[PDB]
Structure formats: C-alpha cells, structure tokens
Design a binder for these strands. Structure first.
Length: 163
DNA sequence: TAAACTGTTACAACCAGTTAAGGGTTGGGGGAAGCACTGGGTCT
C-alpha cells in the first residue's frame, strides 16, 4: 500500500482534491481500494505506488483538454472553464493553466510552481485577506499545480452545478 | 228527614301519496417574478 497523504485546507477544496485523487486512481485500475473519510483528510487506501495514478491522470487531463477544445482568447463552454466559473478572467486563466500542465506533466517530471485558488473550488478564496489590520498586495494562499488540476477534475466530473 | 250509586274516558282505518334535491354559464384575467450599490483576477 501507499496511503496517499492529503493536506488539510478546508472540507470543500480538500474533498475536491480527494475526488481528483480517487478519479485518477479508478482511471487505470486500482482494484481493492477504498476511501476513508477523516472529517477533512479524506484519505485513500490503494495497493500501488505510482504507475496507474499517472496513467489515469494523463488520460483524464487529455479528456479535459479535448472537452475544452470541443467546447466553444480561448474562452469555451466547458464546465471547468466557463460553465461554472463566474469570472471572465478565469475563462483565459484556465486554458493557460491547462497548457502549462500539459507542458509540465507529460515527460515524467514533477511540477515546478504554484497557482491561485478560485471561488468555485473554494468559496473562501480571495486576493484580499487580512492578517492583523489590513490585506496584502498579493494572495498568501496558493495551491500546488497537481492539487489544482485534481481539484479541477473533481469539480468538473463529480460535483453538480446549475446555471 | 237525605246530599249519586255505576258501567264508561272513545274505538278503528290512517300517520304523505308522488315528482324532481339545481339547470345553466363561467373557474384569475394580466402586467412582473429586483431594480444598484458592493468585481477578481493578472499584470506593471
């Protein structure tokens, strides 16, 4: 077994990245696996280290890009781009994020940077956050690229939305 | 000089007959179903 560790942020985005983990594992096999909910941890029990998790993730990401291209800068009708996203800036940030993910996680190498977190994935996300008196010039909260992609795939594939 | 004795207190028939107990006609029209105010990202 591997006991894939999942960081704790909030039981909305954390459940989204858990959905991404479980969908990536079920994509490509991963038999005799289970999901153990720990309030917010939402851990996975599977007997594999990393082969089929990569296979399922790349398959799901290829399907993501295909759906984005099929749907119509690079605004489309995709759920993960404009079907649920309320910001016009997201309609262009999602294509570039997916393109960067394609350029990064295809030659068997890890990620190198991070990304912002949107309202749809986590309602508690915003560029203005106070610490003691006021807010900063940027956003202290950041999400890893792999975690961001898994949250995106979980949001588009699992949670339902009404527009 | 006395102060109603007694059989009797209605019988019998019958105790609504029929007919219909709404007929019709319309069962919300017609408008609107939040107007703004608060914008979140990515860059210089």
């Amino acid at each position: 077994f591997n006991e894939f560790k999942t960081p704790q942020i909030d039981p909305i985005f954390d459940l989204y990245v858990a959905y991404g983990y479980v969908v990536s594992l079920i994509r490509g096999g991963a038999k005799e696996a289970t999901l153990i909910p720990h309030g917010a941890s939402y851990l996975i029990q599977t007997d594999v280290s990393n082969e089929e998790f990569r296979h399922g993730l790349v398959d799901a990401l290829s399907s993501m890009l295909s759906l984005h291209i099929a749907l119509a800068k690079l605004v489309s009708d995709a759920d993960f781009s404009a079907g649920a996203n309320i910001n016009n800036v997201y309609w262009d940030s999602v294509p570039r994020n997916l393109e960067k993910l394609m350029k990064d996680l295809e030659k068997k190498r890890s990620v190198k940077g991070t990304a912002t977190i949107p309202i749809t994935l986590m309602p508690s996300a915003g560029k203005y956050m106070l610490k003691h008196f006021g807010v900063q010039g940027g956003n202290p909260i950041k999400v890893d690229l792999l975690n961001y992609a898994l949250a995106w795939v979980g949001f588009h594939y699992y949670t339902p939305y009404i527009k």
